[PDB]
Design a protein around this ligand. Structure first.
Ligand SMILES: [Ca+2]
Ligand SMILES: [Ca+2]
Ligand SMILES: [Ca+2]
Ligand SMILES: [Ca+2]
Ligand SMILES: [Ca+2]
Lengths: 297, 297
């Protein structure tokens, strides 16, 4: 019902951004988004370097969630993501995990045809819509949308998709939730620099939780719970994400930290979100089955 | 069953100078009996990790001389079956693994194997998921301790190295000199504590000699995916190496250019973590085999 337009967009997660809309806890809110190029790239002979880089990574927002105060967390249920008709990718030498291996700058447009993302005649990828950039305002200095952090931001986590609940911190009153950078498809790592970048519309439900039960950001799918951390190195983000899960498990259950460690090492999985942003992002994942067996919800 | 190697014949280093305990021809079935990665030294939960003989950790059964295998070939190794013992073991040690600085006290725990389950406690059970942790050929240069992965394989701790998986390793010295060990009853991506559920057992495999080295090694193919494996000092670099191995393979061997290959990977492939606890860290890039079928590979 409450609908946030793609003209109402920000480039930094900033506590001083004026809210574009407000909602109550439990309200459903629709966010319309531009692609991460602010829809500047519309043909395949248009180079990445041709656009205004001041307008990359627009996030729709911020939303003021009434009842949210410093120390709370948002529980955000992703009910649906609808994408547009065509996505974009850019390959640029010197960018991304293959930067030194790429030879020429390439722009590719991807028709969305049903639930297929058309790479070429013979290659069609599954339509797997996700949110790349989702976040609340940090309490101190503004952080550009292109950088991830404890507040969220540029997480590029493929599990931030329909049916997932995302958990973010409330560090300023009202939270100031903003999102953008939808993808039609993207693998773990986002190794080129980008997913199939695309505009769309996200429907979410936003709940205010008055107790912050675990380290943030975090998310829950139909089957698994995941702690997320970002750092300068993948080495450091992986360790932090893992420690986030173990200390949570230890704190909230009859398990000792050593027992929690054994559980994670035997039954949990460390995953890579993206290795290409100014901070790298990893998530540690444990089946909800185990949390229920340890009496945790 | 074809050729059988007992666990009495173990090596601690992947070394071109280790004398073969056995020979086979290309296509033979080979059975490897293994000791656990403590050489079966921990049998009781009051034994400290620091009470065992460390010059006997990471035993590999082998080396096997594969006749017809020559420098420049690769081995194609089909894991037909892995049988484990009736009890596994884990060790939590302050100063070791991802949780090193969070752990309070050294802890050893025994896991009965019961049916298709790893018994963690009265309330918690893990699925029995047998895998091989240490599999490798002899490096051409100086010997490499079994605990360290490299281009030759070694301590890869990759959970996809499991029954029904085909593993590909380099032949860098004539005969290859294949050795394997370090079986687990369960383990998650990252092996974050330092160990999986460590257990002895028996591996049945078929070993084929391939005369053309078609992709960067090590590598593997499951029933649904193909993956490139790389190890490095940092997980950052292992990730970037695994990814570049996939991308340069696809570019070199298919009609795709390197830009196009990078887009396919970023959009459709996933970067995964094998382990973060060994002297080198290991990562893998995985892409669905139906994309290779499409590309005529
Ligand atoms: Ca992004
Ligand atoms: Ca994006
Ligand atoms: Ca506890
Ligand atoms: Ca190992
Ligand atoms: Ca092991």
């Amino acid at each position: 019902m409450i609908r946030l337009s793609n003209e109402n967009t920000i480039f930094f997660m900033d506590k001083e951004n004026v809210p574009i809309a407000s909602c109550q806890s439990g309200d459903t809110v629709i966010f319309e988004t531009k692609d991460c190029f602010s829809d500047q790239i519309t043909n395949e002979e248009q180079a990445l370097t041709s656009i205004d880089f001041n307008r990359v990574n627009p996030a729709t927002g911020p939303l003021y969630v009434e009842g949210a105060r410093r120390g709370d967390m948002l529980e955000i249920e992703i009910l649906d993501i609808k994408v547009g008709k065509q996505g974009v990718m850019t390959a640029a030498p010197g960018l991304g995990a293959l930067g030194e291996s790429l030879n020429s700058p390439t722009t590719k447009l991807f028709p969305i045809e049903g639930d297929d993302v058309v790479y070429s005649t013979g290659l069609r990828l599954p339509l797997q819509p996700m949110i790349g950039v989702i976040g609340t305002a940090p309490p101190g200095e503004p952080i550009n949308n292109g950088t991830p952090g404890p507040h969220g931001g540029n997480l590029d986590t493929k599990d931030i998709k329909p049916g997932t609940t995302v958990y973010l911190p409330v560090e300023v009153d009202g939270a100031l939730l903003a999102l953008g950078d939808l993808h039609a498809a993207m693998g773990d790592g986002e190794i080129l620099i980008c997913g199939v970048e695309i505009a769309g519309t996200v429907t979410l439900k936003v709940n205010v939780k008055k107790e912050r039960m675990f380290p943030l950001p975090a998310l829950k799918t139909d089957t698994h719970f995941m702690t997320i951390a970002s750092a300068e190195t993948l080495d450091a983000a992986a360790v932090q994400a893992t420690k986030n899960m173990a200390t949570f498990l230890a704190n909230r259950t009859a398990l000792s930290i050593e027992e929690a460690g054994m559980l994670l090492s035997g039954a949990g999985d460390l995953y890579v979100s993206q290795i290409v942003n100014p901070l790298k992002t990893a998530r540690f994942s444990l089946a909800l089955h185990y949390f229920e067996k340890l009496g945790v919800d």
